[PDB]
Amino acid sequence: AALPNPYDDPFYTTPSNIGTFAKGQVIQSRKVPTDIGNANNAASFQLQYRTTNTQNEAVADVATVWIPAKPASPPKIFSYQVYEDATALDCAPSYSYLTGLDQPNKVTAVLDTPIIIGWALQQGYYVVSSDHEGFKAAFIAGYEEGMAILDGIRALKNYQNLPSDSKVALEGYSGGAHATVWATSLAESYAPELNIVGASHGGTPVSAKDTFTFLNGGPFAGFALAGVSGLSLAHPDMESFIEARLNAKGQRTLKQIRGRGFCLPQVVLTYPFLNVFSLVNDTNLLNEAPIASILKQETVVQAEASYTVSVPKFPRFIWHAIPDEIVPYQPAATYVKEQCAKGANINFSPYPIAEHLTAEIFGLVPSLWFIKQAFDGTTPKVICGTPIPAIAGITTPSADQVLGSDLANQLRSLDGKQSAFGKPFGPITPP
C-alpha cells in the first residue's frame, strides 16, 4: 500500500514517554493518501495520539482524519467506527483506508464505508475514524474501543484547532456498532467535554458473552474465536488463564488468528462450525475466574453488568434485523428497553424481515438522516424505544433526498454485491 505494513512501521508503536502526553494529545501526524480523500477532494492525515488501555495504562494509537474542502460551520465532527473484526495489527482501519490494493482488510473500507464518510464530507463535516482496537488489535474489548475513539475525536479537535464545544456525532454498524455503543457509554466519565449531539448504530453486539454463545459452533464461529482472542489481548489475567488451558490445536489456532495478514475475510473463511471449546481442556471456562467476571464488565446490558452502566441522554437511532443471524437481536432490544426506562432518547428500528447484511442497508439512509437532524437540533420527539422499522421514503426522506443522486446511486450498486461477511447486500427498502 501507500505505506509499509503497520507491523513494519514505528508510527504504530508506543513511545516510552507516553505518560507525559494528555488524553487525545497528538504525538505525531502525517499526510496520507486515501481512496475516500481523493474521491471527495478532502485532505487526509493519520494522527498518532495518546489514549488509555483497559488496564488504565497510557498507550498510543492511530486515527485517520479527513478535512472537508468546504467545512460546515460552526465545525461539526463525525466519528465513523469500522467493523474491523480481526485480531491482527495490519487489519487496522487506518491501513485499510490508504490508497493501495494489497491491505488484507481493505474490504472493510470500501462498500458502505465510503458512502457514509463521503456523505459526511459532502455535508461539510470533519471526519475521524480511529483504530478502535488499538495496537494489540483487541477486538471487542469495549473499554479499549470506547477510550480510543473518544480520544481520536479529541485528537482531531487538537490537530485542527476546533472549538471545544464543536458538535460531535458517531456512527457504526456490526463490530463498528459495538465500538460506537462503548464510546457513547464512556463519554460521560472519560470524555465529558465532547459535545455529542447524536449517535447512530445498528447490528449492535451489546453483550460479549451473549454474542459468543450465539456464534459458537455456527457458520460465523470465527467471530467467537476472534472475540476470545481480542478480549484476552485487553485482559492479561484472562490471557494467562486461557494460555494455561489451550491444547496443541488451541495453541496453533490462537497464534493463527493473531498472525499478520489474518483479517476479517480469513476469520470468516477459516473457522465455520468451529466449537471454541474444542481448543481447550476445560468446557466450564465461561464460569470460572477471571473470565466470568470479565464477561460482567464487557457488557452494556445492565441485567448482566457488574457495574452501573451509563445512560447517554442525547438523541440516538439504533437499528437491528429481528432475524439477525450473526449478532443476536434480543440482547440489543434488552439494552434499548433498559436505557429507555432510565430516561434515554432512543429512536429504535427493529426490522421484522431482514438479516444482518440486508439491515446494514435498510437502516443506512435513516441513520444518516438522523445524524443530519442531530447536528441541526431537529431530531423528532419520539416515545423512547418504540419498535418502528425506519424506511427511507416513508419515515425519512427518500435516498436521493438524503444522500443526493450520486451517493444514492452508489448505495443502489451494493444490492446483490458480496459484503465483507460473504453474504450479499440487498436494497435500500425492504421488498
Short mmCIF file of C-alpha atoms in Angstrom, two decimals:
data_model
loop_
_atom_site.label_atom_id
_atom_site.label_comp_id
_atom_site.label_asym_id
_atom_site.label_seq_id
_atom_site.Cartn_x
_atom_site.Cartn_y
_atom_site.Cartn_z
CA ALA A 1 0.00 0.00 0.00
CA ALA A 2 0.94 3.71 0.18
CA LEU A 3 2.79 2.97 3.49
CA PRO A 4 4.61 -0.07 4.89
CA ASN A 5 2.66 -2.77 6.69
CA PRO A 6 1.81 -1.39 10.20
CA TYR A 7 3.85 -4.26 11.76
CA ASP A 8 6.89 -2.76 9.96
CA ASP A 9 6.13 0.82 10.97
CA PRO A 10 7.23 2.65 14.23
CA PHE A 11 4.24 5.02 13.74
CA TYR A 12 2.38 2.02 15.16
CA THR A 13 4.37 1.84 18.42
CA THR A 14 4.07 3.41 21.81
CA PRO A 15 6.95 5.67 22.88
CA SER A 16 8.49 5.23 26.31
CA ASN A 17 7.40 8.74 27.38
CA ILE A 18 3.69 8.13 26.56
CA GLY A 19 2.63 9.10 30.13
CA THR A 20 3.76 12.70 29.59
CA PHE A 21 1.02 13.12 26.97
CA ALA A 22 -2.53 14.13 27.77
CA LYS A 23 -5.51 12.04 26.62
CA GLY A 24 -6.13 12.86 22.99
CA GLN A 25 -2.89 14.77 22.62
CA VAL A 26 -1.30 14.48 19.14
CA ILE A 27 2.19 12.82 19.42
CA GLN A 28 2.93 12.98 15.68
CA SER A 29 0.95 13.25 12.43
CA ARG A 30 1.44 12.54 8.72
CA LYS A 31 -0.39 13.45 5.48
CA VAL A 32 -1.71 10.21 3.84
CA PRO A 33 -3.35 9.41 0.58
CA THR A 34 -6.73 7.64 0.90
CA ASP A 35 -9.30 6.45 -1.59
CA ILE A 36 -12.01 8.45 0.20
CA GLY A 37 -9.88 11.62 0.35
CA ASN A 38 -9.12 11.52 -3.39
CA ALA A 39 -12.75 10.77 -4.26
CA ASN A 40 -14.08 13.68 -2.14
CA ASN A 41 -11.38 16.32 -2.50
CA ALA A 42 -10.61 16.12 1.24
CA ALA A 43 -7.10 16.06 2.67
CA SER A 44 -6.42 13.03 4.88
CA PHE A 45 -3.94 12.65 7.75
CA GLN A 46 -3.09 9.96 10.26
CA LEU A 47 -2.67 11.13 13.84
CA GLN A 48 -0.58 9.22 16.34
CA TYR A 49 -2.14 10.20 19.67
CA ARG A 50 -2.23 9.27 23.29
CA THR A 51 -5.03 7.21 24.75
CA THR A 52 -5.69 4.67 27.52
CA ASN A 53 -5.95 0.93 27.52
CA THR A 54 -8.18 -1.47 29.54
CA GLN A 55 -5.54 -1.72 32.36
CA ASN A 56 -5.77 2.07 32.57
CA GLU A 57 -2.29 2.46 31.05
CA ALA A 58 -1.33 5.37 28.77
CA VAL A 59 -0.76 3.99 25.23
CA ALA A 60 -0.57 5.48 21.73
CA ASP A 61 -2.97 4.73 18.91
CA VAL A 62 -3.64 5.90 15.33
CA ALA A 63 -6.65 7.65 13.81
CA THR A 64 -7.43 8.84 10.26
CA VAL A 65 -8.97 12.25 9.69
CA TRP A 66 -10.44 13.93 6.58
CA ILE A 67 -10.72 17.70 6.25
CA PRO A 68 -13.70 18.78 4.13
CA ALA A 69 -12.99 21.18 1.19
CA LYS A 70 -15.94 23.34 2.35
CA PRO A 71 -16.31 22.84 6.14
CA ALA A 72 -19.79 23.37 7.54
CA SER A 73 -19.82 25.97 10.30
CA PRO A 74 -19.71 26.09 13.22
CA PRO A 75 -17.44 22.97 12.95
CA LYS A 76 -19.17 19.57 13.20
CA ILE A 77 -17.35 16.26 13.69
CA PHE A 78 -18.50 12.85 12.50
CA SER A 79 -16.82 9.72 14.05
CA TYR A 80 -17.18 6.61 11.94
CA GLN A 81 -16.50 3.24 13.50
CA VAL A 82 -15.45 0.41 11.06
CA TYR A 83 -16.25 -3.33 11.56
CA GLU A 84 -12.55 -4.38 11.71
CA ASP A 85 -13.47 -7.75 13.35
CA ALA A 86 -9.92 -9.16 13.49
CA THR A 87 -7.05 -9.54 15.95
CA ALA A 88 -4.02 -8.76 13.76
CA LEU A 89 -2.34 -5.31 13.70
CA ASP A 90 -2.40 -4.88 9.85
CA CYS A 91 -6.22 -5.25 9.83
CA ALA A 92 -6.32 -1.67 11.21
CA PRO A 93 -8.80 0.78 9.74
CA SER A 94 -6.02 3.41 9.12
CA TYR A 95 -4.08 0.98 6.88
CA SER A 96 -7.25 -0.20 5.06
CA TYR A 97 -8.20 3.41 4.16
CA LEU A 98 -4.93 4.18 2.27
CA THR A 99 -4.74 4.15 -1.50
CA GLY A 100 -3.49 0.66 -2.30
CA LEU A 101 -4.90 -2.75 -3.06
CA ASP A 102 -2.94 -5.27 -1.02
CA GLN A 103 -4.15 -4.40 2.53
CA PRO A 104 -5.66 -7.56 3.93
CA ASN A 105 -8.78 -5.83 5.50
CA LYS A 106 -9.29 -3.45 2.60
CA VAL A 107 -12.87 -4.76 2.19
CA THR A 108 -13.97 -3.02 5.43
CA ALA A 109 -13.03 0.37 3.93
CA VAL A 110 -14.88 0.02 0.61
CA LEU A 111 -18.57 -0.80 0.02
CA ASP A 112 -20.82 1.10 2.57
CA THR A 113 -17.92 2.84 4.39
CA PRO A 114 -17.03 5.26 1.54
CA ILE A 115 -20.72 6.09 1.02
CA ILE A 116 -21.07 7.10 4.69
CA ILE A 117 -17.79 9.00 5.05
CA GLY A 118 -18.25 10.54 1.55
CA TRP A 119 -21.73 11.69 2.57
CA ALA A 120 -20.43 13.23 5.85
CA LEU A 121 -17.72 15.11 3.89
CA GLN A 122 -20.31 16.40 1.41
CA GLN A 123 -22.30 17.81 4.39
CA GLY A 124 -19.10 19.66 5.37
CA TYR A 125 -18.33 17.59 8.47
CA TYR A 126 -14.78 16.82 9.71
CA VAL A 127 -14.44 13.01 9.76
CA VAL A 128 -12.43 10.92 12.18
CA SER A 129 -12.16 7.12 12.13
CA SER A 130 -9.94 5.74 14.93
CA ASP A 131 -8.19 2.36 15.06
CA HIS A 132 -10.51 1.41 17.94
CA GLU A 133 -8.91 -1.99 18.63
CA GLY A 134 -5.66 -0.21 19.41
CA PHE A 135 -2.11 -1.56 18.82
CA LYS A 136 -2.93 -5.02 20.35
CA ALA A 137 -5.86 -5.46 17.93
CA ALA A 138 -8.11 -6.18 20.94
CA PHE A 139 -11.32 -6.83 19.00
CA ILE A 140 -14.44 -6.45 21.16
CA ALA A 141 -12.66 -5.03 24.19
CA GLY A 142 -15.24 -2.30 24.95
CA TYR A 143 -13.21 -0.09 27.35
CA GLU A 144 -10.30 -0.33 24.90
CA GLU A 145 -12.53 0.75 21.98
CA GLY A 146 -14.50 3.40 23.81
CA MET A 147 -11.45 5.26 25.13
CA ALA A 148 -9.52 5.02 21.80
CA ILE A 149 -12.50 6.53 19.93
CA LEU A 150 -13.23 9.40 22.32
CA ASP A 151 -9.50 10.17 22.34
CA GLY A 152 -9.39 10.10 18.48
CA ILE A 153 -12.17 12.77 18.46
CA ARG A 154 -10.09 14.78 20.97
CA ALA A 155 -7.06 14.44 18.67
CA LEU A 156 -8.94 15.74 15.61
CA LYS A 157 -10.06 18.80 17.70
CA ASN A 158 -6.44 19.37 18.82
CA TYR A 159 -5.00 18.73 15.36
CA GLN A 160 -7.42 21.14 13.63
CA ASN A 161 -7.82 23.69 16.48
CA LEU A 162 -11.57 23.17 16.53
CA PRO A 163 -13.68 24.90 19.21
CA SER A 164 -14.13 22.82 22.39
CA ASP A 165 -17.95 22.67 22.03
CA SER A 166 -17.77 21.54 18.35
CA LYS A 167 -20.82 19.29 17.79
CA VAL A 168 -19.97 15.58 17.61
CA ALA A 169 -21.95 12.63 16.15
CA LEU A 170 -20.98 8.91 16.00
CA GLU A 171 -21.93 6.15 13.58
CA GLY A 172 -21.23 2.45 13.05
CA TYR A 173 -22.60 -0.96 12.14
CA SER A 174 -21.83 -4.51 13.40
CA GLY A 175 -18.36 -4.61 15.10
CA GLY A 176 -18.34 -0.84 14.49
CA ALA A 177 -21.62 -0.58 16.45
CA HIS A 178 -20.01 -2.36 19.44
CA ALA A 179 -17.25 0.26 19.25
CA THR A 180 -19.84 3.06 18.88
CA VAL A 181 -22.02 1.98 21.84
CA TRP A 182 -18.95 1.69 24.02
CA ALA A 183 -17.76 5.20 23.07
CA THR A 184 -21.22 6.61 23.92
CA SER A 185 -21.20 4.72 27.26
CA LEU A 186 -17.81 6.08 28.31
CA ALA A 187 -18.37 9.68 27.12
CA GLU A 188 -19.78 10.94 30.47
CA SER A 189 -16.97 9.57 32.67
CA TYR A 190 -14.00 9.56 30.27
CA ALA A 191 -14.61 12.46 27.84
CA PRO A 192 -17.45 14.71 29.11
CA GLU A 193 -16.28 17.88 27.33
CA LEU A 194 -17.16 16.27 23.94
CA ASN A 195 -20.42 17.96 22.82
CA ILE A 196 -22.07 14.74 21.47
CA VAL A 197 -25.42 15.68 19.85
CA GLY A 198 -26.17 12.24 18.33
CA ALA A 199 -25.24 8.67 17.71
CA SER A 200 -26.42 6.02 15.28
CA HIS A 201 -25.61 2.33 15.23
CA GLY A 202 -27.04 -0.95 14.05
CA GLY A 203 -26.48 -4.67 14.30
CA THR A 204 -25.06 -3.91 17.80
CA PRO A 205 -23.18 -6.59 19.86
CA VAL A 206 -24.03 -5.27 23.42
CA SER A 207 -23.01 -8.36 25.46
CA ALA A 208 -19.75 -10.11 24.73
CA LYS A 209 -20.98 -13.35 26.40
CA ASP A 210 -24.30 -13.32 24.52
CA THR A 211 -22.69 -12.69 21.17
CA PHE A 212 -20.25 -15.53 21.93
CA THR A 213 -22.98 -18.10 22.79
CA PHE A 214 -24.98 -17.08 19.66
CA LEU A 215 -21.96 -17.52 17.32
CA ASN A 216 -20.03 -20.53 18.72
CA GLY A 217 -20.31 -23.71 16.53
CA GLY A 218 -22.08 -21.87 13.68
CA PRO A 219 -21.07 -20.54 10.22
CA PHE A 220 -19.52 -17.40 11.75
CA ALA A 221 -17.85 -19.05 14.74
CA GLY A 222 -14.60 -17.37 13.62
CA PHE A 223 -16.06 -14.21 15.18
CA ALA A 224 -16.48 -16.07 18.51
CA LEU A 225 -12.81 -17.08 18.41
CA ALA A 226 -11.85 -13.50 17.37
CA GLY A 227 -13.70 -12.14 20.47
CA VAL A 228 -11.90 -14.60 22.77
CA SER A 229 -8.55 -13.52 21.20
CA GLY A 230 -9.45 -9.77 21.31
CA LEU A 231 -10.66 -9.90 24.91
CA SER A 232 -7.51 -11.82 26.03
CA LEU A 233 -5.42 -9.08 24.34
CA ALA A 234 -7.06 -6.46 26.60
CA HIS A 235 -7.12 -8.56 29.86
CA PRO A 236 -3.73 -10.12 30.82
CA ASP A 237 -5.02 -12.45 33.56
CA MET A 238 -7.69 -13.87 31.11
CA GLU A 239 -4.82 -14.33 28.63
CA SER A 240 -2.71 -16.36 31.21
CA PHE A 241 -5.69 -18.35 32.29
CA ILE A 242 -6.56 -19.28 28.70
CA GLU A 243 -2.88 -19.93 27.70
CA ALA A 244 -2.62 -22.48 30.51
CA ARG A 245 -5.66 -24.37 29.10
CA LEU A 246 -5.07 -24.42 25.35
CA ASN A 247 -4.41 -27.90 23.95
CA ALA A 248 -1.99 -28.24 20.98
CA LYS A 249 -4.80 -27.38 18.47
CA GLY A 250 -5.85 -24.32 20.54
CA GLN A 251 -2.23 -23.17 20.52
CA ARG A 252 -1.94 -23.46 16.78
CA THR A 253 -5.34 -21.72 16.31
CA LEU A 254 -4.83 -18.72 18.67
CA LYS A 255 -1.44 -17.99 17.01
CA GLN A 256 -3.10 -18.27 13.59
CA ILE A 257 -5.89 -15.70 14.27
CA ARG A 258 -3.26 -13.33 15.62
CA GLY A 259 -0.99 -13.81 12.63
CA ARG A 260 -0.03 -10.84 10.42
CA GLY A 261 -2.47 -10.63 7.46
CA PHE A 262 -5.21 -12.71 9.15
CA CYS A 263 -8.12 -10.32 8.87
CA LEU A 264 -11.96 -10.47 8.61
CA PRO A 265 -12.06 -12.44 5.30
CA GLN A 266 -9.80 -15.13 6.78
CA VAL A 267 -11.74 -15.10 10.04
CA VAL A 268 -14.98 -15.81 8.02
CA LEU A 269 -13.40 -18.50 5.74
CA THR A 270 -11.16 -20.42 8.13
CA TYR A 271 -13.49 -21.17 11.03
CA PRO A 272 -17.05 -22.13 10.05
CA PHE A 273 -18.54 -24.56 12.57
CA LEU A 274 -15.62 -24.34 15.00
CA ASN A 275 -16.54 -25.02 18.62
CA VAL A 276 -14.12 -22.79 20.53
CA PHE A 277 -14.35 -25.23 23.46
CA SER A 278 -12.53 -27.79 21.23
CA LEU A 279 -9.42 -25.56 21.71
CA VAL A 280 -9.22 -26.03 25.48
CA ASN A 281 -9.24 -28.83 28.07
CA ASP A 282 -11.93 -27.08 30.14
CA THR A 283 -15.52 -26.88 28.98
CA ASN A 284 -16.55 -24.74 32.04
CA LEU A 285 -14.34 -21.78 31.07
CA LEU A 286 -17.27 -19.34 30.84
CA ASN A 287 -17.97 -19.96 34.50
CA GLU A 288 -14.51 -19.65 36.01
CA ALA A 289 -12.41 -16.67 37.15
CA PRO A 290 -11.11 -14.42 35.79
CA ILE A 291 -13.37 -14.96 32.73
CA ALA A 292 -16.86 -14.88 34.31
CA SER A 293 -16.18 -11.54 35.98
CA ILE A 294 -14.58 -10.06 32.81
CA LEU A 295 -17.77 -11.01 30.91
CA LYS A 296 -19.76 -8.92 33.54
CA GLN A 297 -17.63 -5.84 32.78
CA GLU A 298 -17.60 -6.46 28.99
CA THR A 299 -21.34 -5.80 28.61
CA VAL A 300 -23.64 -2.76 28.45
CA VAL A 301 -26.71 -4.84 29.34
CA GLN A 302 -27.37 -3.77 32.92
CA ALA A 303 -29.15 -7.03 33.89
CA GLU A 304 -25.80 -8.71 33.16
CA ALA A 305 -23.35 -5.94 34.21
CA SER A 306 -21.37 -5.97 37.46
CA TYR A 307 -21.14 -2.10 37.39
CA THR A 308 -23.64 0.75 36.76
CA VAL A 309 -23.91 1.21 33.01
CA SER A 310 -24.06 4.84 31.71
CA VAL A 311 -27.30 6.08 30.08
CA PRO A 312 -26.43 8.67 27.36
CA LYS A 313 -29.27 11.26 27.17
CA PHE A 314 -28.52 12.80 23.74
CA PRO A 315 -30.69 11.63 20.74
CA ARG A 316 -29.87 8.11 19.47
CA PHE A 317 -31.00 5.97 16.49
CA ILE A 318 -30.46 2.20 16.93
CA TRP A 319 -31.41 -0.41 14.29
CA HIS A 320 -31.29 -4.24 14.09
CA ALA A 321 -32.63 -7.16 11.94
CA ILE A 322 -35.02 -9.04 14.25
CA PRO A 323 -33.96 -12.21 12.35
CA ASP A 324 -30.27 -11.34 12.66
CA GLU A 325 -28.25 -14.48 12.07
CA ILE A 326 -24.83 -13.02 13.13
CA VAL A 327 -25.44 -10.54 16.04
CA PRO A 328 -28.33 -11.53 18.27
CA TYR A 329 -31.38 -9.22 18.27
CA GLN A 330 -32.80 -9.71 21.88
CA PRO A 331 -29.75 -8.51 23.84
CA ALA A 332 -29.93 -5.24 21.85
CA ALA A 333 -33.70 -4.98 22.38
CA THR A 334 -32.93 -5.53 26.13
CA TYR A 335 -30.33 -2.72 26.10
CA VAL A 336 -32.83 -0.32 24.42
CA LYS A 337 -35.62 -1.23 26.90
CA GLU A 338 -33.34 -0.68 29.92
CA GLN A 339 -31.92 2.61 28.64
CA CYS A 340 -35.38 3.89 27.81
CA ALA A 341 -36.53 3.12 31.44
CA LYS A 342 -33.75 5.41 32.71
CA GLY A 343 -34.54 8.49 30.55
CA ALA A 344 -32.69 7.79 27.26
CA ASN A 345 -33.82 9.23 23.92
CA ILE A 346 -33.67 6.31 21.52
CA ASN A 347 -35.46 6.01 18.22
CA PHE A 348 -35.41 2.16 17.92
CA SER A 349 -35.75 0.49 14.48
CA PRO A 350 -36.05 -3.32 14.59
CA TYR A 351 -36.61 -4.79 11.06
CA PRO A 352 -39.01 -7.73 11.23
CA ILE A 353 -37.97 -9.23 7.80
CA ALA A 354 -34.22 -8.81 7.42
CA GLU A 355 -30.90 -10.41 8.13
CA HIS A 356 -27.54 -8.91 9.15
CA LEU A 357 -26.43 -7.71 5.70
CA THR A 358 -29.77 -6.56 4.46
CA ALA A 359 -30.46 -4.47 7.65
CA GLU A 360 -26.99 -2.90 7.10
CA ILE A 361 -28.53 -1.19 4.06
CA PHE A 362 -32.16 -0.73 5.26
CA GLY A 363 -31.02 1.39 8.25
CA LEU A 364 -28.37 3.36 6.36
CA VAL A 365 -30.47 6.27 4.95
CA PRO A 366 -32.47 6.55 8.20
CA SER A 367 -29.12 6.55 10.06
CA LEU A 368 -27.58 9.47 8.07
CA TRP A 369 -30.82 11.48 8.02
CA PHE A 370 -30.90 11.01 11.80
CA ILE A 371 -27.32 12.26 12.17
CA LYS A 372 -28.03 15.31 9.96
CA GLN A 373 -31.10 16.14 12.14
CA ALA A 374 -28.97 15.68 15.33
CA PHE A 375 -26.44 18.22 14.06
CA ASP A 376 -29.32 20.55 13.18
CA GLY A 377 -31.12 20.15 16.54
CA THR A 378 -34.16 18.79 14.73
CA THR A 379 -34.41 15.17 15.82
CA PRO A 380 -38.15 14.44 16.25
CA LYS A 381 -39.65 13.82 19.65
CA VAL A 382 -40.47 10.08 19.98
CA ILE A 383 -41.59 7.81 22.81
CA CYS A 384 -38.25 6.15 23.65
CA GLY A 385 -37.71 2.66 22.38
CA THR A 386 -40.94 2.21 20.43
CA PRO A 387 -40.12 -0.50 17.86
CA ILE A 388 -40.70 1.19 14.47
CA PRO A 389 -38.95 -0.06 11.23
CA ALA A 390 -37.39 3.07 9.72
CA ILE A 391 -37.96 3.01 5.95
CA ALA A 392 -36.38 5.54 3.54
CA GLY A 393 -39.11 7.45 1.73
CA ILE A 394 -41.68 6.53 4.39
CA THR A 395 -40.33 7.56 7.86
CA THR A 396 -37.49 9.66 6.38
CA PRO A 397 -36.95 11.49 3.12
CA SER A 398 -36.01 9.38 0.01
CA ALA A 399 -32.45 8.07 -0.55
CA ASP A 400 -31.89 10.77 -3.25
CA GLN A 401 -33.16 13.43 -0.88
CA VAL A 402 -30.88 12.35 1.97
CA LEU A 403 -27.78 11.22 0.06
CA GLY A 404 -28.05 13.12 -3.27
CA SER A 405 -28.35 11.11 -6.53
CA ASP A 406 -24.65 10.32 -6.83
CA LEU A 407 -24.31 8.71 -3.38
CA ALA A 408 -27.75 7.06 -3.62
CA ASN A 409 -26.76 5.55 -6.99
CA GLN A 410 -23.60 4.22 -5.25
CA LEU A 411 -25.80 2.72 -2.49
CA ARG A 412 -28.08 1.03 -5.10
CA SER A 413 -24.97 -0.50 -6.67
CA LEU A 414 -24.32 -2.55 -3.50
CA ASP A 415 -27.55 -4.52 -3.95
CA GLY A 416 -26.50 -8.14 -4.62
CA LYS A 417 -22.80 -7.47 -4.14
CA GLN A 418 -20.85 -9.53 -1.58
CA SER A 419 -20.21 -7.91 1.77
CA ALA A 420 -17.09 -8.48 3.90
CA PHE A 421 -19.11 -11.34 5.54
CA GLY A 422 -19.58 -13.28 2.27
CA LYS A 423 -23.33 -12.59 2.12
CA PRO A 424 -24.85 -10.11 -0.40
CA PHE A 425 -26.24 -6.67 0.44
CA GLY A 426 -29.87 -6.04 -0.61
CA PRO A 427 -31.94 -2.96 -1.49
CA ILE A 428 -32.48 0.37 0.29
CA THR A 429 -36.01 -0.55 1.46
CA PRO A 430 -37.39 -3.94 2.49
CA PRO A 431 -39.33 -5.51 -0.51
#
